[PDB]
Design an enzyme around this catalytic site. Structure first.
Site, short mmCIF file in Angstrom:
data_model
loop_
_atom_site.label_atom_id
_atom_site.label_comp_id
_atom_site.label_asym_id
_atom_site.label_seq_id
_atom_site.Cartn_x
_atom_site.Cartn_y
_atom_site.Cartn_z
N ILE B 27 -182.34 18.22 8.69
CA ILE B 27 -183.08 19.56 8.66
C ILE B 27 -183.38 20.21 9.97
CG2 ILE B 27 -183.93 19.29 6.19
CD1 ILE B 27 -186.79 19.19 7.81
N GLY B 28 -182.99 18.83 11.39
CA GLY B 28 -182.37 20.27 12.36
C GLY B 28 -182.36 18.77 13.61
N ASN B 29 -182.56 19.29 14.83
CA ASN B 29 -182.47 18.26 15.60
C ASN B 29 -183.19 18.72 16.99
OD1 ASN B 29 -180.36 19.59 17.21
ND2 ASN B 29 -178.45 18.22 16.32
N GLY B 30 -183.28 18.32 17.54
CA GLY B 30 -183.50 18.03 19.31
C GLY B 30 -183.54 16.77 20.43
N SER B 31 -184.24 17.53 21.27
CA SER B 31 -184.43 16.22 22.54
C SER B 31 -184.64 15.25 22.27
CB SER B 31 -185.07 16.71 23.58
OG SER B 31 -184.62 17.58 24.05
N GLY B 33 -184.18 13.04 19.01
CA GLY B 33 -184.36 13.06 17.60
C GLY B 33 -183.39 13.70 16.19
N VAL B 35 -184.84 15.70 12.62
CA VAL B 35 -185.35 15.58 11.79
C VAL B 35 -184.72 16.39 10.75
CG1 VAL B 35 -187.93 17.29 10.90
CG2 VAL B 35 -186.41 17.78 13.30
N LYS B 50 -189.82 13.88 11.70
CA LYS B 50 -189.10 14.02 13.30
C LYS B 50 -188.82 12.35 13.22
CE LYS B 50 -189.90 16.36 17.21
NZ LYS B 50 -190.99 17.08 17.73
N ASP B 146 -193.95 25.88 24.68
CA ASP B 146 -192.97 25.71 24.02
C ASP B 146 -192.56 26.79 22.83
OD1 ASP B 146 -190.15 26.17 23.94
OD2 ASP B 146 -189.63 23.96 23.10
C1 LIG Z 1 -191.75 20.05 11.04
C2 LIG Z 1 -191.42 20.25 9.69
C3 LIG Z 1 -191.40 21.03 8.66
N1 LIG Z 1 -189.99 22.22 8.51
C4 LIG Z 1 -190.04 22.65 9.08
N2 LIG Z 1 -188.85 23.13 8.30
C5 LIG Z 1 -187.23 23.96 8.29
C6 LIG Z 1 -186.51 23.17 8.94
C7 LIG Z 1 -185.32 24.38 9.71
C8 LIG Z 1 -185.09 25.19 8.94
C9 LIG Z 1 -186.13 26.04 7.84
C10 LIG Z 1 -186.80 25.09 7.77
N3 LIG Z 1 -189.02 22.30 9.99
C11 LIG Z 1 -189.73 21.72 11.00
C12 LIG Z 1 -189.31 20.72 11.92
C13 LIG Z 1 -188.45 21.98 12.41
N4 LIG Z 1 -188.81 21.34 14.03
C14 LIG Z 1 -189.09 20.88 14.78
C15 LIG Z 1 -189.43 19.88 15.56
O1 LIG Z 1 -190.25 19.43 15.92
N5 LIG Z 1 -187.78 20.29 16.26
C16 LIG Z 1 -187.96 19.53 17.56
C17 LIG Z 1 -187.08 20.92 18.46
O2 LIG Z 1 -188.33 21.27 18.51
C18 LIG Z 1 -187.42 18.06 17.81
C19 LIG Z 1 -186.99 17.68 16.70
C20 LIG Z 1 -186.74 16.15 17.40
C21 LIG Z 1 -186.47 16.15 18.46
C22 LIG Z 1 -186.52 16.68 19.34
C23 LIG Z 1 -187.69 17.51 19.16
C24 LIG Z 1 -189.63 19.95 13.06
#
Ligand SMILES: Cc1cnc(Nc2ccccc2)nc1-c1c[nH]c(C(=O)N[C@H](CO)c2ccccc2)c1
Ligand SMILES: Cc1cnc(Nc2ccccc2)nc1-c1c[nH]c(C(=O)N[C@H](CO)c2ccccc2)c1
Lengths: 359, 347
Positions: B27-31, B33, B35, B50, B146
């Site tokens: 559902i996502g990514n970041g530094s 890692g 998600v 995460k 942030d």
């Molecule tokens: C924790 C979480 C729960 N649900 C969602 N839902 C969602 C995500 C995308 C679109 C629609 C709904 N998202 C999260 C979540 C979003 N960002 C992060 C997070 O911590 N991201 C950071 C970047 O900001 C990150 C991710 C991976 C590695 C390092 C940092 C958790």
């Protein structure tokens, strides 16, 4: 003051000061103005010179009443084939009532590296290497030139790199952040644009040198090779992570050389990734080697622009039989001046190929 | 299909338990890692996992901070566990958090794209909840660092907002310097842009004001691809920062060479119909002097949020508002008397 006249076409006549040479006011008349860009405190117009029909760019910015404009003073001193030319300058009124505006009449160039890189990128393609060489080589010449006066551009990025599609000529523009960097004088760390910023700037150093421009130029080279920015991120931390994922974690000595305002040494310990694997399979090895020498943590370890120009990635440009793909001749590349070579005169040995020393 | 791990509960006792989940998807990514979304086998409940690379030299700061947090406007850490991942032989920390379906980023963009603005009722609900989560973290001396629409999760149906991404979060201690390179483009407090290392938690308040202004405008209030361009956009609203204001912000270095620009009336920054209380609130968040900015708890007590304290308020969907007044002592600690406004008589 300026005068407006009028087939009914609107004409603007101003008395302007020549960008270079003796202050001999000239009456300049132009028409067909249109906005081509915006920036901090101003706008860039395209206009057509009445008599010659020649297109020019007019950069109009708010004039600070307390001092002379630094961008103007820097541009008045410049004269290089790879730097956009200041033809004239004049003052006028503008949007904000009662304020004075500085108008810089510059050469108009049809494209930017930004738009070109984007046309290819959107089409999932890459700019032929020959153009990457031609563009990068010309960028490094413009930098060797400005740096020879101790002037650092501070905001090298594809949007500030103009280009003539037909001649393959590149011109550096936007000297609004440019500044002479004097050893021992501190400078602001908040200049330079996202994705192009040297790590020492991200780290908050105020004692940085002109080598910040070389890091930026390496980012542009890598981006033209990759089809996208090499070090993206919407924050400084994310940018440093992208950097660390290529170069590996900097050493404590490297941090000391970069000299941050402050840092915690809390980034994970990551080993460098081989530059060769960063790019697509058939990327010329010399392109890769060049990047590795531009994109270094230690600012003093980076090639200087003149050394970059002498790099082997550019050897093809020194081939007496080189032509543009369109059959045309390459633009002028070896007419180096003494000023231009001043950092390291002996480099003229590689820079000026034997065929160019022919009588 | 099914993954079974022995995971440690996010809160309380350190008593791990077997946890099984399935249906994972990115559902996502970041530094460092990624998600994932996953479904808990036992409850069918959706969670986000995460997964980040783990530095063995230290304890993971994001994890340690999240283990201490317990608030309705903060994404909950259910479990955490270690595992292997992409980079062979490396260890990964996995945070099992609540899954939330939307973000302020996506929602704001849907509205923007359709040439529509988010109804004010949602601006109030979202901003108020953001300020509660900040009052809460700041009460422990923790600064998020942030705050931005992508880090603000939203449940469309309940109108519940949850703060996420504690990867930059840190306890800020007076006299300790901190890195100036945190915080994302368009949200950054001017003292960060100026390179200060002595900044406080008020950097989060400036960020929150940028989000509010953006939800009101339909686009970022202070855009720019460089620090200098950002400061220019700021200066065009607030006017040139005074020598004293610079000193309060305390740059690593500055030239004092910006043109002398007079402030632009806040009222003319927004559309004509913009509620005056929304404008007054921004003016008190987006200030050069960091000490002059409202604290999150004062922001919650602002009159722009009075409608939320109305006993007859309802969501447009016909449902009741989510929990808004269950304040704790910890939460109110900065200014206890505010409980007087914050906890309406009907609550
Ligand atoms: C924790 C979480 C729960 N649900 C969602 N839902 C969602 C995500 C995308 C679109 C629609 C709904 N998202 C999260 C979540 C979003 N960002 C992060 C997070 O911590 N991201 C950071 C970047 O900001 C990150 C991710 C991976 C590695 C390092 C940092 C958790
Ligand atoms: C000087 C110049 C000549 N030609 C062109 N051509 C061009 C522009 C866009 C598309 C295609 C061709 N551009 C320029 C020019 C471009 N940028 C600037 C410049 O100085 N920009 C800065 C922003 O980077 C600026 C503009 C206005 C106010 C303050 C800064 C000059």
């Amino acid at each position: 003051s300026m005068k407006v006249s009028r087939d009914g076409s609107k004409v603007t006549t101003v008395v302007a000061t020549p960008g270079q040479g003796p202050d001999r006011p000239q009456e300049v008349s132009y028409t067909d103005t249109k906005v081509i860009g915006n920036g901090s405190f101003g706008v860039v117009y395209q206009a057509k010179l009445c008599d010659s029909g020649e297109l020019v760019a007019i950069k109009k910015v708010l004039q600070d009443k307390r001092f002379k404009n630094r961008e103007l003073q820097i541009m008045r001193k410049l004269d290089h084939c790879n730097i956009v030319r200041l033809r004239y300058f004049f003052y006028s009124s503008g949007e904000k009532k009662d304020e004075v505006y500085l108008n810089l009449v510059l050469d108009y160039v049809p494209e930017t590296v930004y738009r070109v890189a984007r046309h290819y990128s959107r089409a999932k393609q890459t700019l032929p290497v020959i153009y990457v060489k031609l563009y990068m080589y010309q960028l490094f010449r413009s930098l060797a030139y400005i740096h020879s006066f101790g002037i650092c551009h501070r905001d090298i990025k594809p949007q500030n790199l103009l280009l003539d599609p037909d001649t393959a000529v590149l011109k550096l523009c936007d000297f609004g952040s440019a500044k002479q960097l004097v050893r021992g004088e501190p400078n602001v760390s908040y200049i330079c644009s996202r994705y192009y910023r040297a790590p020492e700037l991200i780290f908050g150093a105020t004692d940085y040198t002109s080598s910040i421009d070389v890091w930026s130029a390496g980012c542009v080279l890598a981006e033209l090779l990759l089809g996208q920015p090499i070090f993206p991120g919407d924050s400084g931390v994310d940018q440093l992570v992208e950097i660390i994922k290529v170069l590996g974690t900097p050493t404590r000595e490297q941090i000391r050389e970069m000299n941050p305002n402050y840092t915690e040494f809390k980034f994970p310990q990551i080993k460098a990734h081989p530059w060769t694997k960063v790019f697509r399979p058939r990327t010329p090895p010399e392109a890769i080697a060049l990047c590795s020498r531009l994109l270094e943590y230690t600012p003093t370890a980076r090639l200087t622009p003149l050394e970059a120009c002498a790099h082997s990635f550019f050897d093809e440009l020194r081939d007496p039989n080189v032509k543009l793909p369109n059959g045309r001749d390459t633009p002028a590349l070896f007419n180096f001046t003494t000023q231009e070579l001043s950092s390291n005169p002996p480099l003229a040995t590689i820079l000026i190929p034997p065929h160019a020393r022919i009588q």
